[PDB]
Amino acid sequence: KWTYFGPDGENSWSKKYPSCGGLLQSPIDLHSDILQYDASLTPLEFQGYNLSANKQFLLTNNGHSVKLNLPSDMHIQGLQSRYSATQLHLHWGNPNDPHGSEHTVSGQHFAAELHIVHYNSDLYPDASTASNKSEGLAVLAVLIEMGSFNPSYDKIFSHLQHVKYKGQEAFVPGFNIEELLPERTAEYYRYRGSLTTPPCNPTVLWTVFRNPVQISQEQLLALETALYCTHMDDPSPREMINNFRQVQKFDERLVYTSFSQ
Amino acid sequence: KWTYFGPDGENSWSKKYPSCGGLLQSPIDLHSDILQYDASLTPLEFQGYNLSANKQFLLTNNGHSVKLNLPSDMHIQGLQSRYSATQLHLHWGNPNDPHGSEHTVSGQHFAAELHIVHYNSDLYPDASTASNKSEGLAVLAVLIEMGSFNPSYDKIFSHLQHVKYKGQEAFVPGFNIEELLPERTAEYYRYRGSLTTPPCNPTVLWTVFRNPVQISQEQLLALETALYCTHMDDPSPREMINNFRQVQKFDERLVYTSFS
């Protein structure tokens, strides 16, 4: 059992999960000193993001986040191997401190962060297997701020109130995930990192888009209040909040940008 | 041992020291949402900070920072118990990313940070005994930014070449420690936290001053380049850099300010 608050909190993850205390840890603060423009950085292409509306995809509160499972036929192109979708999830903060992105940009926490997890399907038979292996994962990160209502994100946020507790499962009608991407996806930060949750394997190529998306005050509140980290039967409920890991040292590492300034 | 890097860096500190994976950990990001003004916070009074120019004080490279020993006559007034000085020390980054303050303000790392450690000498016989007890410590933080040369800080820095390796020591003549403090010291952040290094006891009354000081770029480069974590006879040597902890979750606590 690992949490984001307390003695089983992030500082103690290394105890049972050695990689959490290891190399190439994520997330990071995105700031000019570690940034380098790289003009070999080409736009990604997104394939099979348009999931059938006439089909439904499994949403899961896993006691640590709310995740939507995704079909392996959805993949990205523009990286070295094929990367096929496995899942998306979010991290966020709390109504007292609604700044719970994981990556930060010149020290600024955004409101929340959306992650779309892909695995290496040129090399590995699944995501689980790929996760423990080198260059085995690729994560897309969309920074989220407060602003206008977001009908596309609502396509997820409306099933929340019905997966409130640990282990619970429910169904979203398939939709076009590219709707969850920001403006100018060609402009992004790229670097080598790790899973931000136990077991923290250093196996992730991160792409964090330069531009954020906007969801409204109420959707943001909704996301921050809907879920619990605990089961239905648990005598000591815990609200699912602050489910972002703190930024990590970035020693001898560099973040590559597809954009100049 | 414990380091700021590698498999013995900060995310593994809790495997050696229970408190570093506990509550109320320092340092923290100083940002708008969690600041609460508190008109109750009166200016501290610094007693016995004008050290005798006629006395030498030990400056030690301990493999983690450079620390100057301070006399137990040196104390803070203004708090509920008397707090007496034990030492001061610093934290910093590296020439390639010269942002190594422990506290950040609105997410921004300053160049470096100066810490002046005190223990509660109304309750306890010394610092080490006080290190694990209620209301044990009060630490003063001074945020450091790169800029104008600072004569006073050079009263410490000018000696850096003498404490280059771990276990190495210089002697420093007394000057006024208050000269190290930024202006308007009445203006500060205040919160309950911990030691930023192992054993990380959650026994520190923190006071971070609002205003940064400046040191020159030469002065900061000396601090970033003179010192080593390893002994002189270590020919597999570690540079002393990035000797600061990442900011901690701080999300039931508030930080109180004395200014608006």
Ligand SMILES: NS(=O)(=O)c1c(F)c(F)c(S(=O)(=O)CCO)c(NC2CCCCCCC2)c1F
């Ligand atoms: N920010 S993250 O992208 O590194 C991340 C999470 F934050 C996260 F919580 C998870 S998971 O524990 O919720 C479970 C995945 O469905 C994964 N998942 C990865 C690691 C777990 C191995 C199997 C799935 C591969 C991705 C994950 F990748």
Ligand SMILES: NS(=O)(=O)c1c(F)c(F)c(S(=O)(=O)CCO)c(NC2CCCCCCC2)c1F
């Ligand atoms: N950031 S800090 O102000 O809490 C701090 C340090 F960063 C630090 F490095 C030290 S250290 O020089 O002694 C090396 C760490 O072992 C102390 N020293 C205090 C805490 C040590 C235990 C009890 C005595 C109080 C001094 C210390 F207090």
Ligand SMILES: [Zn+2]
């Ligand atoms: Zn994630």
Ligand SMILES: [Zn+2]
């Ligand atoms: Zn310190």
